[PDB]
Design a protein around this ligand. Sequence first.
Ligand code: HEM
Length: 153
Amino acid sequence: GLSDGEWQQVLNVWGKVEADIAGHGQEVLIRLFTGHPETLEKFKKFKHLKTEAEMKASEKLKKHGTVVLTALGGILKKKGHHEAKLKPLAQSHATKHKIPIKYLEFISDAIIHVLHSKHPGDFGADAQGAMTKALELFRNDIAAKYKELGFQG
Ligand code: HEM
């Protein structure tokens, strides 16, 4: 779905993430939860966090941020051949935690927002378009697996 140049733009900005993956992950989750509070309800560990300030002080939230962006990074680095890396993630988010595709769109938006905020010089208009396409491919392929797994997403 993406050109070689588009994947380069994706992996270029992703390199910036790997220098502070916990900080990025924290900011992504806080953007998600504050922008779409219904998503917070999915997390038994975190839904007690009422405010952005409480979220920022949570070590466990930050650690989960690391887990999320580590998994996403592994998937992005597989470019268009990401099915093997994506498979276990689709499975867990269709069974252990049922996460609607809409919420994956919300976190996609959050990722794009955080990347634009922290690395604008590596995330101009075209790079943002490339990442948008990469995260769309991600959601589309998860959705396809969801259905096989019997989850309407
Ligand atoms: C870029 C998208 C996402 C990625 C890469 C991702 C990745 C992960 C990973 C690696 C785990 C731990 C292992 C696993 O269960 O698979 C996890 C757990 C979890 N995810 Fe996601 N996730 C994403 C989006 C979401 C969204 C949008 C929600 C809810 C709105 C969500 C809800 C959860 C919950 C509730 C857990 C368990 C947390 C815990 O153990 O306390 N995920 N996720």
